[PDB]
């Protein structure tokens, strides 16, 4: 399509004083840029059409010319960072922001889309478009009287406003967006709901201060129930989002637990999808890495048998997370809490992972067993027998010749103190 038409003639006709000739040239540029997923962005940039397309955005007298030019610029900005930057250096963003107030719906939507690609390029462009004032008019589009297809585009732009972490979006911007996400999290459309939660998952992955902004918005009680949502794409997005929150402080982890998050995990731990099981255990591992009250919460939720059950006869990925969840409990748990773990037959499946090829897993499991023995001082002999009965002591002794320094050093030390 590019090899069979004069780009120069397009560029020169796009600068013509005749509106009909101009529109046909911009339309041809749009079709060149939107006929497939590999358009000739560089050739049209090099031809000098960017200043012409940008100028077309100002022509309020020709909404069709604004629409076609915004469409052309949208797909140019959809490319690499170099091609997106070319649009930014053309000073198109202030004109896109003006077009957000256009009375013509397609001109607004296309301006929204173009701004979304620019915001999604990185934190610099994101903050640039934020600083010019994109958030206020963007969120004003969110109403009951917005076409669903437009609202999907609006939510996608909001996702990009939350995306990058170095640095994260400004505090004031996060605080403006969260009330809108509170509205959108109740939407029935799956595409909007999934995007709303993904936006939350990016905010909760931006640091403990951003996690606190999410909590202070009041939206966490509305995110947690989505762990049992009928659409699996909503569940996994919500599971990662809340999983990011419990990577924060103990106080932030407790907020999630106060929303009865653990109630949704029996179903998650028995879910057919193995990756959802692995994710649900990674979540719980960050809970058992908390304080004693949070270890107790996992106990009271009847999840310990299910974690031990998944540790045994589970897929390799989930067993690794289960080992982390168990070992973390030996670090944070009280004597009675590790005692309850023992009573539930944790030693055979825990020791069965001493033969895994992953060096990190063996290290994590050996640390857990070490903490178990050190915790039951009076009954260390009884636990040493339990380790021996299931063949664990044999596997520890084989690990005395392991290649890793921390593994064979600890294996000898464990045997010196308790065997």
């Amino acid at each position: 399509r590019v090899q069979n038409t004069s780009l120069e003639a397009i560029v020169q006709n796009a600068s013509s004083d005749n509106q009909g000739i101009q529109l046909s040239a911009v339309q041809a540029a749009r079709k060149l840029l939107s006929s497939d997923r590999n358009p000739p962005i560089d050739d049209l940039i090099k031809s000098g059409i960017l200043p012409i397309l940008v100028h077309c955005l100002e022509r309020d007298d020709n909404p069709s010319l604004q629409f076609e030019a915004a469409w052309a610029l949208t797909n140019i900005a959809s490319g690499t960072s170099e091609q997106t930057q070319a649009v930014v250096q053309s000073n198109a963003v202030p004109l896109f922001l003006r077009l957000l107030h256009s009375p013509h719906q397609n001109v607004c939507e296309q301006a929204v889309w173009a701004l979304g690609n620019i915001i999604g390029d990185g934190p610099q462009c994101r903050d640039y478009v934020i600083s010019l004032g994109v958030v206020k008019p963007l969120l004003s589009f969110i109403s009951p009287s917005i076409p669903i297809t437009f609202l999907r585009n609006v939510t996608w732009v909001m996702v990009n406003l939350c995306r990058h972490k170095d640095p994260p979006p400004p505090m004031e911007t996060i605080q403006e967006i969260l009330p809108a996400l509170c509205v959108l999290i109740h939407h029935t459309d799956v595409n909007i709901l999934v995007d709303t939660v993904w936006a939350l998952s990016y905010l909760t992955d931006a640091g403990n201060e951003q996690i606190q902004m999410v909590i202070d918005s009041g939206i966490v009680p509305h995110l947690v129930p989505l762990l049992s949502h009928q659409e699996v794409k909503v569940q996994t997005a919500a599971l990662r989002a809340v999983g990011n929150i419990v990577t924060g402080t103990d106080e932030q982890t407790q907020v999630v637990l106060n929303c009865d998050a653990l109630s949704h995990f029996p179903a998650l731990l028995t879910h057919p999808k193995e990756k959802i099981n692995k994710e649900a255990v990674w979540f719980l591992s960050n809970i058992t890495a908390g304080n004693q009250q949070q270890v107790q919460a996992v106990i009271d939720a009847n999840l310990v048998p299910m974690i031990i059950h998944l540790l045994d006869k589970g897929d390799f990925g989930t067993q690794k997370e289960a080992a982390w969840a168990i070992s973390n409990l030996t670090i944070s748990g009280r004597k009675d809490q590790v005692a309850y773990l023992i009573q539930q037959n944790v030693i055979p499946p825990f020791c069965n992972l001493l033969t895994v090829k992953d060096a990190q897993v063996v290290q994590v499991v050996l640390d857990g067993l070490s903490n178990i023995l050190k915790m039951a001082e009076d009954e260390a002999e009884t636990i040493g027998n339990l380790i021996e009965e299931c063949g664990g002591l044999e596997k520890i002794e084989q690990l005395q010749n392991h290649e890793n320094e921390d593994i064979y050093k600890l294996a000898y030390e464990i045997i010196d103190q308790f065997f």
Partner: protein, 82 residues
């Protein structure tokens, strides 16, 4: 001082230092080891922190790629196609 995964630069650095500090000073409590490690982290230069910063970024990238619905994630840039 909690260790949540994926770990940040300080947490991966503390992981190695914790074990050494425990052996060298067996009469030191876990709370005091965390306090000193957090303070000693402030003395490190950017060059000494860089390996642990790159590891934390590496762990973060894997954590996102291992998202159950990674393929169905919202993309940063999209085209308006015909």
């Amino acid at each position: 001082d909690r260790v949540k995964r994926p770990m940040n630069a300080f947490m991966v650095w503390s992981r190695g230092q914790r074990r050494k500090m425990a052996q060298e000073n067996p009469k030191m409590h876990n709370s005091e080891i965390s306090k000193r490690l957090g303070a000693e982290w402030k003395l490190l230069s950017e060059t000494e922190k860089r390996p642990f910063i790159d590891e934390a970024k590496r762990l973060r990238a894997l954590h996102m790629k291992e998202h159950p619905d990674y393929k169905y994630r919202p993309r940063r840039k999209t085209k308006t196609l015909m």
